[PDB]
Amino acid sequence: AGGKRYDLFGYEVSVATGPFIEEIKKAQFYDDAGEVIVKMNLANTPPDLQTYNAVLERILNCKSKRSQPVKGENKFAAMMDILEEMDARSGIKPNAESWGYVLKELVQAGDFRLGWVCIAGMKSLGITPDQALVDANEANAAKAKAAGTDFPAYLKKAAPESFDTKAWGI
Amino acid sequence: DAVKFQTLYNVLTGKQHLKDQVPVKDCNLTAIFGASWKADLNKWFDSEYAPKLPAAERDSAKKSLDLYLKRVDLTRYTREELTTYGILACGPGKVDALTEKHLLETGKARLEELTAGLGNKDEGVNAFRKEVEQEGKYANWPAEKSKALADKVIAAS
Amino acid sequence: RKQVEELHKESPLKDYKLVLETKVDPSIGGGYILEVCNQVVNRSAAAAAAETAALAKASAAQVDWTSLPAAPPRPSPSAPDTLIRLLGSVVDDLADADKVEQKYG
Amino acid sequence: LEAKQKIGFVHGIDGTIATIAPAASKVTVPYNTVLEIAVSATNIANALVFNLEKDGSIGVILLDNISEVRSGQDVYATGSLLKIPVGFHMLGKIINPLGKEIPTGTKLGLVEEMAPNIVSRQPVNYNLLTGYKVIDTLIPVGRGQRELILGDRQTGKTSIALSTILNQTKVNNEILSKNNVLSVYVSIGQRCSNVARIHRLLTEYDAMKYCTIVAATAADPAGLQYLAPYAGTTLGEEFRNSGRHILLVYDDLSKQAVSYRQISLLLRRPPGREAYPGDVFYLHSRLLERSAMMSPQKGSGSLTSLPIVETLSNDVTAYIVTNVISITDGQIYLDAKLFTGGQRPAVNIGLSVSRVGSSAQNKAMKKVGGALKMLMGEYRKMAGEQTSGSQNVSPVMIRGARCLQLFNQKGPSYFMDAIVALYAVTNGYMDDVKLQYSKFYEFLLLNKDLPVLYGQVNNKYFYMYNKNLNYFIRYFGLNHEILEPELKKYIEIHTNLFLDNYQSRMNELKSDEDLVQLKNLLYACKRTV
Ligand SMILES: Nc1ncnc2c1ncn2[C@@H]1O[C@H](COP(=O)(O)OP(=O)(O)OP(=O)(O)O)[C@@H](O)[C@H]1O
Numbered sequence: 001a002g003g004k005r006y007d008l009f010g011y012e013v014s015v016a017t018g019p020f021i022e023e024i025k026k027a028q029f030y031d032d033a034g035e036v037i038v039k040m041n042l043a044n045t046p047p048d049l050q051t052y053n054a055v056l057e058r059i060l061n062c063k064s065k066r067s068q069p070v071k072g073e074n075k076f077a078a079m080m081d082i083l084e085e086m087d088a089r090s091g092i093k094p095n096a097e098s099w100g101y102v103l104k105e106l107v108q109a110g111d112f113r114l115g116w117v118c119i120a121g122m123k124s125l126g127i128t129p130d131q132a133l134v135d136a137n138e139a140n141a142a143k144a145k146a147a148g149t150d151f152p153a154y155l156k157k158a159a160p161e162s163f164d165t166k167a168w169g170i
Numbered sequence: 171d172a173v174k175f176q177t178l179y180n181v182l183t184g185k186q187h188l189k190d191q192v193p194v195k196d197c198n199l200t201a202i203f204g205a206s207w208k209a210d211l212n213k214w215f216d217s218e219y220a221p222k223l224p225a226a227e228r229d230s231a232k233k234s235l236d237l238y239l240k241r242v243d244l245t246r247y248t249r250e251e252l253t254t255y256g257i258l259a260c261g262p263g264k265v266d267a268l269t270e271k272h273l274l275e276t277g278k279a280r281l282e283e284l285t286a287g288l289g290n291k292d293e294g295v296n297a298f299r300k301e302v303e304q305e306g307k308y309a310n311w312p313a314e315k316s317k318a319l320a321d322k323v324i325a326a327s
Numbered sequence: 328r329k330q331v332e333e334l335h336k337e338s339p340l341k342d343y344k345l346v347l348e349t350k351v352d353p354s355i356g357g358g359y360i361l362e363v364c365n366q367v368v369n370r371s372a373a374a375a376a377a378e379t380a381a382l383a384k385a386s387a388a389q390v391d392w393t394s395l396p397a398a399p400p401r402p403s404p405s406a407p408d409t410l411i412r413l414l415g416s417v418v419d420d421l422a423d424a425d426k427v428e429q430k431y432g
Numbered sequence: 433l434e435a436k437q438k439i440g441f442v443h444g445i446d447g448t449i450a451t452i453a454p455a456a457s458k459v460t461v462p463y464n465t466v467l468e469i470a471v472s473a474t475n476i477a478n479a480l481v482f483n484l485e486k487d488g489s490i491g492v493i494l495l496d497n498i499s500e501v502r503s504g505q506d507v508y509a510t511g512s513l514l515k516i517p518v519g520f521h522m523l524g525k526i527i528n529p530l531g532k533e534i535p536t537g538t539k540l541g542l543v544e545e546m547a548p549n550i551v552s553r554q555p556v557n558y559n560l561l562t563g564y565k566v567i568d569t570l571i572p573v574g575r576g577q578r579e580l581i582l583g584d585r586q587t588g589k590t591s592i593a594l595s596t597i598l599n600q601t602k603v604n605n606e607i608l609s610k611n612n613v614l615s616v617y618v619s620i621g622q623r624c625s626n627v628a629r630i631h632r633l634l635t636e637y638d639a640m641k642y643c644t645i646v647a648a649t650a651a652d653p654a655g656l657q658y659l660a661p662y663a664g665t666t667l668g669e670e671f672r673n674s675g676r677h678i679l680l681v682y683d684d685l686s687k688q689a690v691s692y693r694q695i696s697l698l699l700r701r702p703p704g705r706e707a708y709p710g711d712v713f714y715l716h717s718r719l720l721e722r723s724a725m726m727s728p729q730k731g732s733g734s735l736t737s738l739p740i741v742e743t744l745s746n747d748v749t750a751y752i753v754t755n756v757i758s759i760t761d762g763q764i765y766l767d768a769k770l771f772t773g774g775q776r777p778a779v780n781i782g783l784s785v786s787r788v789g790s791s792a793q794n795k796a797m798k799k800v801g802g803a804l805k806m807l808m809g810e811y812r813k814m815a816g817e818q819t820s821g822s823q824n825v826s827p828v829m830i831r832g833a834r835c836l837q838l839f840n841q842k843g844p845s846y847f848m849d850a851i852v853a854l855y856a857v858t859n860g861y862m863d864d865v866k867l868q869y870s871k872f873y874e875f876l877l878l879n880k881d882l883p884v885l886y887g888q889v890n891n892k893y894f895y896m897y898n899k900n901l902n903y904f905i906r907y908f909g910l911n912h913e914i915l916e917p918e919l920k921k922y923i924e925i926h927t928n929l930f931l932d933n934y935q936s937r938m939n940e941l942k943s944d945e946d947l948v949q950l951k952n953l954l955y956a957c958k959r960t961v
């Protein structure tokens with residue numbers, strides 16, 4: 001009951017994505033959602049925008065990538081890799097809901113600079129943020145401003161007056 | 171089993187270094203092993219190592235094994251607590267009494283610190299119990315033992 | 328014998344007559360070796376006992392008791408603003424000393 | 433229950449190979465299948481069929497327990513191709529190509545399979561950041577690509593691949609386990625100490641979680657050195673069929689061609705050019721056409737390949753060299769004249785190309801690479817001139833030399849840490865400084881934020897401390913309304929603060945102690961940055 005989709009080789013393509021979206025929503029660790037995307041794509045069912053937004057929801061709302069912890073986890077980098085897989089690889093483009101899930105994560109993480117990047121990217125793409133998130137971004141910014149956490153401390157310390165390979169820390 | 175116990179005997183007797191820049195310690199050994207260290211070690215000795223060689227070397231081997239067991243029991247403690255807070259300065263036989271003394275004294279000191287900083291003896295005792303229980307849970311230490319120790323320090327205060 | 332003619336039936340040929348020859352090994356004291364229609368089955372003591380010993384040897388070799396196990400991984404620190412405000416410039420040195428002690432000590 | 437089938441007895445053995453004499457006539461062996469040789473009542477020597485003869489004899493490649501072989505031993509037959517275990521449980525291990533694990537201090541996959549046909553593979557769309565600016569800008573490597581690495585001995589052929597493996601790890605720890613690119617290092621005929629040092633390097637930098645190692649050392653049999661890269665591609669099979677990504681690194685294929693020549697000549701095949709049998713082109717073709725970027729129907733998986741071939745006297749005219757340049761898409765040619773002449777990585781841009789181009793690399797890298805190609809094509813025509821017009825030097829003569837300074841490295845460079853350094857070059861902000869301080873510049877640009885230190889903070893977001901702007905740069909591009917002005921109002925202040933505080937103090941150095949200290953400082957910066 002929709003516009004039939006086709007691959008790059010013109011082959012007919014399945015649309016029955018629901019049974020995999022349900023396994024994504026039922027997932028508990030947001031790497032299993034990616035594995036469901038893989039097992040979905042093997043079955044000639046490529047992901048759609050609704051599926052990607054379900055995956056970004058499961059990412060934003062899950063606790064960890066895998067059962068055991070992992071060093072180097074970045075909740076934002078996975079989402080923006082899904083969005084690179086969206087824009088570049090598959091040609092689909094995100095929406096206000098997608099950037100909403102993106103901005104919620106930067107609000108939770110308190111990173112107001114990446115937040116302001118997302119706020120600017122929205123309006124450069126016509127999207128408009130939620131003021132509930134814009135005000136929380138400005139609140140985190142004001143907090144880090146008054147607290148001196150506008151930048152890290154290691155940048156706000158004097159440099160070696162004398163050039164030395166050890167003093168500079170290399 | 172026999173392989174790991176032979177490796178253990180070699181490490182204790184000093185015929186072998188461990189396979190990195192790693193020290194020998196009760197923690198750093200029992201972590202590798204199954205937490206049945208001394209009993210299974212002595213059992214494997216008395217079973218498979220004592221009857222093989224003659225009694226002459228067996229006596230000295232058992233002696234050295236008891237010495238190294240006592241030495242690792244002493245190694246359990248940290249260096250700073252051993253030296254600075256005076257656990258070892260009197261001697262091995264007094265390590266136990268000095269540990270008990272240091273524990274009671276530092277407990278009294280921490281309690282006095284909490285009461286001076288906060289007052290409200292009930293609140294201070296509660297915070298001390300929370301801190302002691304959390305440190306026991308982190309150090310893999312019995313919660314009943316921690317509660318008994320805390321009550322003992324409170325009574326002795 | 329039962330296994331002999333059963334293997335001869337399982338073979339692709341069975342219409343051909345079967346002639347059986349039995350020989351003696353001084354190396355083998357238990358079990359048998361049977362060959363029919365260029366298909367051999369060895370069920371001997373020398374093979375079975377060595378197979379069971381090989382399993383034990385492999386299992387013992389399979390673990391490095393002399394080595395140290397992989398400790399659980401450490402996630403990112405994410406130091407708190409309070410501790411940073413208390414010690415702005417010192418946490419870097421302390422983290423470096425922590426790395427030094429984690430490697431050496 | 434399980435009766436092993438016998439085919440003959442061991443007739444002859446010549447080192448790594450053997451010849452079987454069949455027992456009966458109606459017995460028939462397949463071709464390329466594995467055989468077994470009961471060297472003892474306990475152990476078994478695996479093998480493989482490579483020839484069959486009118487006499488019924490069988491030309492056999494041996495793979496294990498060669499020293500225990502005799503004449504008259506019973507010879508068995510599995511009637512199946514060679515297979516090995518495959519799966520995620522093998523990642524983080526060094527492994528015999530027979531599947532046996534090499535200590536340190538269910539599923540089965542066919543060793544020789546056909547390649548993905550012309551419908552079962554997508555074109556190259558996504559990049560593979562090797563960490564080096566020449567290979568990320570001007571020679572863009574992508575996924576599902578196969579790119580040769582040429583070079584004389586001890587020039588960085590192994591090190592480019594190791595730096596790729598070490599660059600991808602940080603990314604893979606951040607991105608999901610579907611978009612992460614894993615790795616396989618196949619060492620054919622290499623030295624076991626080189627393998628040990630590689631293992632310890634990966635274990636130090638924690639790049640071993642996302643890497644397995646297929647070891648066939650120099651003491652190993654020639655058949656094992658021969659079937660090592662097929663074992664590597666056999667591991668790539670599973671990540672193809674599971675849609676994942678994976679990188680292959682075939683250390684020297686010249687040693688796999690010497691091994692194949694040894695095999696064929698001892699099995700009495702006719703020689704050919706340079707004593708090779710002749711079908712070593714078809715050999716490497718079978719090995720390398722299995723590389724592909726798989727179709728979305730097949731999961732959109734991939735396997736990249738970076739084979740390495742040693743070179744003698746910087747010639748591209750040898751047989752195997754031409755046969756592999758014929759096969760591989762691009763090539764990273766490393767010139768010993770440039771390694772010896774100072775610059776590292778010693779990439780020769782005139783002989784190193786990439787046959788994918790913009791489609792692999794990033795939106796933010798398209799606009800920079802298209803400027804650097806013009807810039808280097810123009811600098812190639814002028815740089816022969818000993819600089820006479822010291823002040824009359826062209827901006828191309830400036831930017832090119834500073835860009836070569838940025839090309840000088842030791843380890844990999846992060847993508848964000850490369851683009852923001854090259855933008856200043858391409859737009860001429862880094863023209864008043866001298867050539868030698870172009871990397872200390874980068875050091876301050878990436879690790880000592882000058883405007884953050886001297887209080888000149890007018891940029892709202894754009895600062896290099898966060899390190900998460902990499903993905904916004906990657907997605908939006910540099911020529912965008914939200915990122916261009918903040919970028920310029922970071923770089924022009926960084927340049928002005930450098931030119932005012934640092935350049936002056938540097939030019940005020942006269943002593944030999946201080947000049948040697950600043951010397952070693954800039955060389956250390958050229959290595960670490
Ligand atoms: N970019 C670089 N900067 C500094 N040193 C380098 C660089 N690339 C390579 N080297 C040095 O060159 C030496 C050999 O490098 P590498 O191990 O890559 O050689 P190779 O290409 O593997 O040759 P072979 O396989 O014959 O050893 C090492 O000492 C390595 O540190």
Ligand SMILES: [Mg+2]
Nearest residue numbers: 589590591740
């Ligand atoms: Mg090499």
